[PDB]
Design a protein around this motif. Structure first.
Motif, PDB file in Angstrom:
ATOM      1  N   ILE C  19      13.223  37.535  -9.384  1.00 44.14           N
ATOM      2  CA  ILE C  19      13.242  36.712  -8.178  1.00 44.14           C
ATOM      3  C   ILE C  19      14.578  36.862  -7.450  1.00 44.14           C
ATOM      4  CG2 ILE C  19      13.067  34.302  -7.325  1.00 44.14           C
ATOM      5  CD1 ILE C  19      11.325  33.626  -9.679  1.00 44.14           C
ATOM      6  N   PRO C  20      14.557  37.099  -6.133  1.00 37.33           N
ATOM      7  CA  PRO C  20      15.847  37.212  -5.472  1.00 37.33           C
ATOM      8  C   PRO C  20      16.489  35.838  -5.353  1.00 37.33           C
ATOM      9  CG  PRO C  20      14.108  37.341  -3.860  1.00 37.33           C
ATOM     10  CD  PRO C  20      13.439  37.245  -5.189  1.00 37.33           C
ATOM     11  N   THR C  21      17.795  35.809  -5.099  1.00 40.78           N
ATOM     12  CA  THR C  21      18.569  34.573  -5.050  1.00 40.78           C
ATOM     13  C   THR C  21      17.999  33.632  -4.008  1.00 40.78           C
ATOM     14  OG1 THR C  21      20.617  35.513  -5.903  1.00 40.78           O
ATOM     15  CG2 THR C  21      20.832  33.546  -4.538  1.00 40.78           C
ATOM     16  N   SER C  22      17.453  34.200  -2.946  1.00 35.66           N
ATOM     17  CA  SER C  22      16.925  33.443  -1.842  1.00 35.66           C
ATOM     18  C   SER C  22      15.705  34.155  -1.260  1.00 35.66           C
ATOM     19  CB  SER C  22      18.013  33.320  -0.789  1.00 35.66           C
ATOM     20  OG  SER C  22      17.418  33.104   0.466  1.00 35.66           O
ATOM     21  N   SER C  23      14.601  33.431  -1.094  1.00 37.97           N
ATOM     22  CA  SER C  23      13.385  34.000  -0.506  1.00 37.97           C
ATOM     23  C   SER C  23      12.653  32.961   0.319  1.00 37.97           C
ATOM     24  CB  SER C  23      12.445  34.545  -1.584  1.00 37.97           C
ATOM     25  OG  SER C  23      11.927  33.495  -2.409  1.00 37.97           O
ATOM     26  N   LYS C  24      11.794  33.407   1.238  1.00 39.02           N
ATOM     27  CA  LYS C  24      10.882  32.519   1.956  1.00 39.02           C
ATOM     28  C   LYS C  24       9.463  32.670   1.442  1.00 39.02           C
ATOM     29  CE  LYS C  24      10.915  35.620   6.093  1.00 39.02           C
ATOM     30  NZ  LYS C  24      11.361  35.622   7.540  1.00 39.02           N
ATOM     31  N   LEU C  25       8.682  31.607   1.576  1.00 41.54           N
ATOM     32  CA  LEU C  25       7.314  31.588   1.120  1.00 41.54           C
ATOM     33  C   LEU C  25       6.500  30.830   2.131  1.00 41.54           C
ATOM     34  CD1 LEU C  25       5.585  32.060  -1.655  1.00 41.54           C
ATOM     35  CD2 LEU C  25       5.982  29.614  -1.922  1.00 41.54           C
ATOM     36  N   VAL C  26       5.355  31.371   2.514  1.00 39.42           N
ATOM     37  CA  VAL C  26       4.477  30.705   3.488  1.00 39.42           C
ATOM     38  C   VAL C  26       3.247  30.139   2.780  1.00 39.42           C
ATOM     39  CG1 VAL C  26       3.002  31.010   5.541  1.00 39.42           C
ATOM     40  CG2 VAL C  26       5.193  32.160   5.420  1.00 39.42           C
ATOM     41  N   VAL C  27       2.994  28.845   2.963  1.00 41.11           N
ATOM     42  CA  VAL C  27       1.820  28.223   2.353  1.00 41.11           C
ATOM     43  C   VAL C  27       0.859  27.723   3.424  1.00 41.11           C
ATOM     44  CG1 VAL C  27       0.933  26.402   0.804  1.00 41.11           C
ATOM     45  CG2 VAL C  27       3.090  27.532   0.271  1.00 41.11           C
ATOM     46  N   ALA C  40       0.391  33.637  11.594  1.00 37.63           N
ATOM     47  CA  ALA C  40       1.579  33.164  10.870  1.00 37.63           C
ATOM     48  C   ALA C  40       2.170  34.218   9.925  1.00 37.63           C
ATOM     49  CB  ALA C  40       1.275  31.895  10.125  1.00 37.63           C
ATOM     50  N   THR C  43       4.151  36.501  12.326  1.00 42.12           N
ATOM     51  CA  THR C  43       5.322  35.765  12.816  1.00 42.12           C
ATOM     52  C   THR C  43       6.448  35.714  11.789  1.00 42.12           C
ATOM     53  OG1 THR C  43       3.637  34.271  13.733  1.00 42.12           O
ATOM     54  CG2 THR C  43       5.946  33.728  14.186  1.00 42.12           C
ATOM     55  N   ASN C  44       6.070  35.478  10.535  1.00 41.39           N
ATOM     56  CA  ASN C  44       7.019  35.296   9.443  1.00 41.39           C
ATOM     57  C   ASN C  44       7.425  36.581   8.735  1.00 41.39           C
ATOM     58  OD1 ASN C  44       7.530  32.299   9.147  1.00 41.39           O
ATOM     59  ND2 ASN C  44       5.275  32.302   9.157  1.00 41.39           N
ATOM     60  N   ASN C 139       5.623  24.214  -8.321  1.00 39.87           N
ATOM     61  CA  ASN C 139       6.058  25.006  -7.188  1.00 39.87           C
ATOM     62  C   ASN C 139       5.840  26.508  -7.385  1.00 39.87           C
ATOM     63  OD1 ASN C 139       8.885  22.758  -6.655  1.00 39.87           O
ATOM     64  ND2 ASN C 139       6.775  22.590  -5.921  1.00 39.87           N
ATOM     65  N   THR C 140       5.323  27.138  -6.337  1.00 43.43           N
ATOM     66  CA  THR C 140       5.378  28.563  -6.235  1.00 43.43           C
ATOM     67  C   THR C 140       6.803  28.895  -5.871  1.00 43.43           C
ATOM     68  OG1 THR C 140       3.101  28.691  -5.511  1.00 43.43           O
ATOM     69  CG2 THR C 140       4.527  30.591  -5.028  1.00 43.43           C
ATOM     70  N   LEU C 141       7.405  29.773  -6.668  1.00 40.66           N
ATOM     71  CA  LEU C 141       8.807  30.171  -6.513  1.00 40.66           C
ATOM     72  C   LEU C 141       8.949  31.445  -5.683  1.00 40.66           C
ATOM     73  CD1 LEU C 141       9.944  29.621 -10.238  1.00 40.66           C
ATOM     74  CD2 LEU C 141       9.846  27.911  -8.390  1.00 40.66           C
TER      75      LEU C 141
END
Ligand SMILES: Nc1ncnc2c1ncn2[C@@H]1O[C@H](COP(=O)(O)OP(=O)(O)OP(=O)(O)O)[C@@H](O)[C@H]1O
Ligand SMILES: Nc1ncnc2c1ncn2[C@@H]1O[C@H](COP(=O)(O)OP(=O)(O)OP(=O)(O)O)[C@@H](O)[C@H]1O
Ligand SMILES: Nc1ncnc2c1ncn2[C@@H]1O[C@H](COP(=O)(O)O)[C@@H](O)[C@H]1O
Ligand SMILES: [Mg+2]
Ligand SMILES: [Mg+2]
Lengths: 73, 102, 304
Positions: C19-27, C40, C43-44, C139-141
């Protein structure tokens, strides 16, 4: 045996606290699409065409993920 | 996804805002504590999972005319099935906002 | 070769470590309009989004480009027969249309599970997106992919007590697909390519000329570009015209030969950051395909 008087604190909670400790009001993520105490805080995009976009960054051990929820009204 | 705003903003009277979030909390069957006139701890029992979620509401002044309600989630201590703390936080917020704002 | 530096490595690392130190996740909430949901992703700048069922209070599945391709194919055919439901479907209602009686639950993995288990779940479930979900919080990480897993492998095993098989070729290890290769031509309409995507379930198509030499590649990714336009109707155009709209320039299709060592192919794939190489002959005629799935399947059932 005299009456007693109340000197009441008031204000301090007159107006609500002003914002900037170090917490950003707006986050521009243009980009052609590292920050401290904004963890766990709710962010949103403007409601557009009946959709809510909610977002926040959370921490699992040493990893940070920003989660976006797309949710109808 | 370009412009992100912290919480939501309002030009309603501070005392009105706080009173209306409180009525919203009670209507929703959430439980709360008034730390400050502008600071609320709230707790929710999940009607499906039976888990509990906690968050904070804080009102800030951002203009002479404008205020900002701020929501903060509060941390605890192969099929997934029930629960996600992060998603449940968003829903609490969404519920709170819908049930008192605009 | 046998038991392998890869197999032990994978059994001794957690998913968390990738897992990278910081990531985005769209739900996406399942009540969301299908149309808005695919807009979406674009866009993301994201390929897949977990699905959250609010009534049930849990994740129930994924939304990927494959679903998008499936939906566009059904919309296209339905329009010709004057049926326009598709676009007003909520995720909920489309899932009910296809996940019919046959059930496919969400497959996911704990952050504490071996990377081996992650690779085995992707192969066995025939899947390219494995959400890493914390069993404590729900949570999905992060969403784990073949590309990430291979990159991590190339990097943190960089060091060679090298298994003999790294110095063996695709030919002799028999990695990749060398028959029934789905391909299109310079002029092939986009919708025709869709039908091929749906029927063969394959992530990309080599674009060939009259002597079957490869000159381009048309991917599933090249398909969410159709979610840029405010129309949807431009599917009758040729595949060549469709690819012209690409983001970034294009240094030709990334190729390889049957007789390249596995090591050479892994390195090309890892540093090119792409899902597959087109296997080619002396004259650029296509002879097959080597995908990340092929490699990870090889590395996990012990090389070749
Ligand atoms: N982790 C998962 N659990 C359950 N179902 C999934 C999962 N991931 C994908 N699916 C579903 O299975 C199908 C397989 O699609 P896949 O994940 O391969 O799409 P994709 O990853 O974008 O395709 P590709 O990798 O070729 O671009 C899709 O319909 C998708 O909805
Ligand atoms: N062999 C190749 N040579 C040249 N370009 C390629 C090749 N494979 C894919 N591409 C291009 O690269 C872009 C991304 O495609 P690709 O499927 O690799 O991305 P991706 O969906 O993020 O990968 P993955 O599903 O492994 O994470 C697409 O526009 C596609 O046309
Ligand atoms: N256009 C194609 N034609 C035939 N097979 C393919 C094609 N693309 C990928 N494959 C193979 O099918 C499997 C799935 O690959 P991918 O969908 O790219 O992960 C792998 O074994 C590939 O070698
Ligand atoms: Mg895809
Ligand atoms: Mg990718």
């Amino acid at each position: 045996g005299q009456e007693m008087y109340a000197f009441r604190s008031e204000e301090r909670f007159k107006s609500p606290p002003i914002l900037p400790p170090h917490l950003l009001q707006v986050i521009l993520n243009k980009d052609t699409n590292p920050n401290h105490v904004m963890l766990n805080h709710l962010y949103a995009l403007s409601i557009k065409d009946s959709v809510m976009v909610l977002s926040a960054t959370h921490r699992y051990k040493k990893k940070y993920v920003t989660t976006l929820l797309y949710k109808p009204i | 996804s370009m412009a992100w705003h912290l919480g939501i903003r309002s030009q309603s009277r501070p005392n009105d805002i706080m009173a209306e979030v409180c009525r919203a909390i009670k209507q929703l069957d959430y439980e709360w504590k008034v730390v400050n006139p502008y600071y609320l701890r709230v707790r929710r029992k999940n009607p499906v999972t039976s888990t509990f979620s906690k968050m904070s509401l804080q009102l800030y002044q951002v203009d002479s005319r404008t205020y900002l309600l701020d929501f903060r989630s509060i941390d605890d201590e192969v099929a997934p099935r029930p629960g996600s703390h992060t998603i449940e936080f968003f829903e609490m917020c969404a519920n709170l906002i819908k049930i008192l704002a605009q | 070769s046998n038991s392998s530096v890869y197999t032990t490595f994978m059994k001794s690392h957690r998913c968390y470590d990738l897992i990278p130190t910081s990531s985005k996740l769209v739900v996406f909430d399942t009540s969301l309009q299908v149309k808005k949901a695919f807009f979406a992703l674009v866009t993301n700048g994201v390929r897949a989004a977990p699905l959250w069922d609010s009534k049930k209070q849990s994740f129930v599945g994924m939304l990927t480009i494959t679903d998008f391709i499936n939906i566009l194919h059904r919309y296209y055919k339905s329009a010709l027969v004057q049926i326009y439901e598709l676009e007003e479907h909520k995720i909920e209602t489309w899932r009910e249309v296809y996940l019919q009686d046959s059930f496919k639950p969400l497959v996911c993995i704990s952050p504490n599970a071996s990377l081996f288990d992650a690779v085995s779940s992707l192969i066995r479930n025939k899947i390219h997106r494995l959400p890493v979900i914390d069993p404590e919080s729900g949570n999905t990480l992060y969403i784990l992919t073949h590309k990430r897993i291979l990159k991590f492998l190339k990097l943190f095993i960089t060091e060679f007590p090298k298994p003999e098989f790294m110095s063996k070729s695709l030919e002799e290890l028999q990695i990749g697909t060398y028959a029934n290769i789905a391909m299109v031509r310079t002029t092939t309409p986009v919708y025709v390519a869709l039908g091929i995507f749906v029927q063969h379930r394959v992530s990309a198509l080599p674009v060939v000329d009259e002597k079957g030499r490869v000159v381009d590649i048309y991917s599933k990714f090249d398909v969410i570009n159709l979610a840029a336009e405010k129309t949807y109707n431009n599917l009758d155009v040729s595949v060549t015209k469709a690819l012209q709209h690409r983001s970034h320039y294009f240094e030709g299709v990334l190729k390889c030969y049957l007789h390249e060592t596995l090591e050479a192919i892994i390195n090309r794939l890892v540093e090119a950051e792409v899902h597959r190489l087109v296997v080619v002959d002396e004259h650029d005629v296509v002879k097959g395909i080597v995908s990340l799935s092929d490699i990870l399947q090889a590395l996990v059932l012990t090389g070749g």
